[model samples]
Target: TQCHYGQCGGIGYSGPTVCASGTTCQVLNPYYSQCL
Candidate 1:
């Protein structure tokens, strides 16, 4: 998977922020590549 730095609609961002096992979430910044 690719890396982001803003909001991948992940948990704690909008709805749920808890990540399940074997799965991770993140976001993508329009200015930076790894700002999250």
Candidate 2:
């Protein structure tokens, strides 16, 4: 199961890189790197 607004990946980002069915993976910035 995937979590809502989960972090997918981004600049200097260290985390999972995957979005949920309802989530749209997109990482534009570092702090704002996540999907929902």
Candidate 3:
């Protein structure tokens, strides 16, 4: 996982992320992602 700066959930989050297929964005500690 990595942390950048971008917009998510109408809020500024630490991310300019690119998740692979079957994955989704989430606001876990330190701004991470999860597979669903």
Candidate 4:
């Protein structure tokens, strides 16, 4: 999965925060997050 920084469904987002299979969502800040 392409884990882009500060994307949708991440921190500060109200959408789905689930990452791709085998991946996890990591919070970088209140305004930023990524999949790891």
TM per prediction: 0.29, 0.49, 0.31, 0.49
- In angstroms, the error of model 4 at 1 is 8.7
Candidate 3: tens digits of C-alpha lDDT, residues 1-36 = 322332232244445455444455565544334322
Task: Tell me how many clashing residue pairs each candidate has.
Answer: 12, 0, 1, 0
Every model's Cα RMSD, please? Answer: 7.4, 2.5, 6.8, 3.4
lDDT of 1 by residue, 1-36 (tens): 323332235333444343444445544443222223
Best-to-worst ranking by TM-score: 2, 4, 3, 1
Tell me how far candidate 4 lies from the true structure as C-alpha RMSD in angstroms. Answer: 3.4
Error of 1 at 21 (Å): 0.7
Clash pairs for candidate 4: none
Instruction: Tell me the lDDT of model 2 at 18.
Output: 67
- Sliding window of 10 residues with minimal summed lDDT for model 1: 27-36
The candidate 3 region of ten consecutive residues with least summed lDDT is 1-10
For TM-score, the strongest prediction is: 2
lDDT of 2 at 14: 61
Cα deviation at 14, candidate 4, in Å, is 5.1
Give the TM-score (vs. native) of candidate 4. 0.49
Between candidates 2 and 3, name the one with more favorable TM-score. 2
> Model 3, stretches more than 4 Å misplaced?
1-16, 30-36
Write down the lDDT of every candidate, Cα atoms only: 0.37, 0.68, 0.41, 0.58
Tens digits of per-residue lDDT for model 2, 1-36:
335777776766566666778788766676666777
Best by lDDT: 2
lDDT of 1 at 16: 38
